[PDB]
Amino acid sequence: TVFHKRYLKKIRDLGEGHFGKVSLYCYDPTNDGTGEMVAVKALKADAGPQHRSGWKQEIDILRTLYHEHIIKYKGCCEDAGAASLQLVMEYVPLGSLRDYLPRHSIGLAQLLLFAQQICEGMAYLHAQHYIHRNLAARNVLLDNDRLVKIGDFGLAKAVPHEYYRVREDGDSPVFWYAPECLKEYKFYYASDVWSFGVTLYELLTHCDSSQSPPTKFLELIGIAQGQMTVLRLTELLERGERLPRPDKCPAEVYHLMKNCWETEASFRPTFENLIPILKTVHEKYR
Ligand SMILES: O=C(Nc1nccc2[nH]c(-c3c(Cl)cccc3Cl)nc12)C1CC1
């Protein structure tokens, strides 16, 4: 599919993606305002050869993924300004779970349905042989109060092999990362399950920033540490220390969370394992 830049009417900026920014447009070929509202992802113009090869990878990943709990790719556009392409996605107006949950009081049942949907989308992603590497509430879009979709794929990679070797990066979401990613710089399919546990914790805390993984971990570690945040994080996780049980979170749900956080990656449930578990848990509390 292809969109004409000539009919893209900028409305506002949505935020920052990994290789550039996300912007809201009205694609209006008839010029009457009835046009579809689209979310467009662009390559930041001053990007080097490294950020450009990474952007082409994300484009390719996004134009092949089709799942009901994964953001719908619409097509592309020629970005004459950055001499590349602009990724046209469906606009999800209610936004991210990180933005939505602290402003709307969502019940336990719905939060579990969201977790179930994240798993459905993630089991599909793993079957397509890709790892997400950035599974967080921030990257989960709410289509409606009963429908959630994985919305960002900036750090997503193809697994040829059960793990991918990651680079020592400063933009890595370390507070959502398994010990083997921090220690060995290896990202397994199971590493994505650790992140789901963290995403699940964020939902049961309603994305309250005072209860957030960075706030919680940086209270435990402290900030007197000189270039030793990741080391202390790896160390506290080895000691078996974890983020606490969110208020009013069911006991067995916290057990599932703690199981997604097994130090040994092999002892963590797959995304396929979690789908029947979460369907049952959602039914029990609905
Ligand atoms: O931005 C909105 N919806 C969105 N619709 C469609 C696509 C969207 N991509 C994002 C988004 C942004 Cl900007 C930054 C980090 C992670 C993500 Cl996932 N948000 C998207 C809502 C709030 C207006």
UniProtKB/Swiss-Prot annotation:
Free-text description of this protein's post-translational modifications in UniProt: Phosphorylated. Phosphorylation by JAK1 at Tyr-163 and Tyr-164 induces kinase activation.
Catalytic residues as annotated in Swiss-Prot or TrEMBL: N134
Positions that bind ATP: L14, G15, E16, G17, H18, F19, G20, K21, V22, K41
Phosphotyrosine: residues bearing it: Y163, Y164
Domain Protein kinase: 8-285
Tissue: Observed in all cell lines analyzed. Expressed in a variety of lymphoid and non-lymphoid cell lines.
Domain of life, source organism: Eukaryota
Associated disease: Immunodeficiency 35: A primary immunodeficiency characterized by recurrent skin abscesses, pneumonia, and highly elevated serum IgE.
Subunit-level organization: Interacts (via FERM domain) with JAKMIP1. Interacts with PIK3R1; this interaction is important for cell migration. Interacts with MPL/TPOR.
Homology family: Belongs to the protein kinase superfamily. Tyr protein kinase family. JAK subfamily.
Record function comment: Tyrosine kinase of the non-receptor type involved in numerous cytokines and interferons signaling, which regulates cell growth, development, cell migration, innate and adaptive immunity. Plays both structural and catalytic roles in numerous interleukins and interferons (IFN-alpha/beta) signaling. Associates with heterodimeric cytokine receptor complexes and activates STAT family members including STAT1, STAT3, STAT4 or STAT6.
Name of the featured protein: Non-receptor tyrosine-protein kinase TYK2
Organism: Homo sapiens
Gene this chain is encoded by: TYK2
Complete-protein stretch covered: 890 to 1176 of 1187
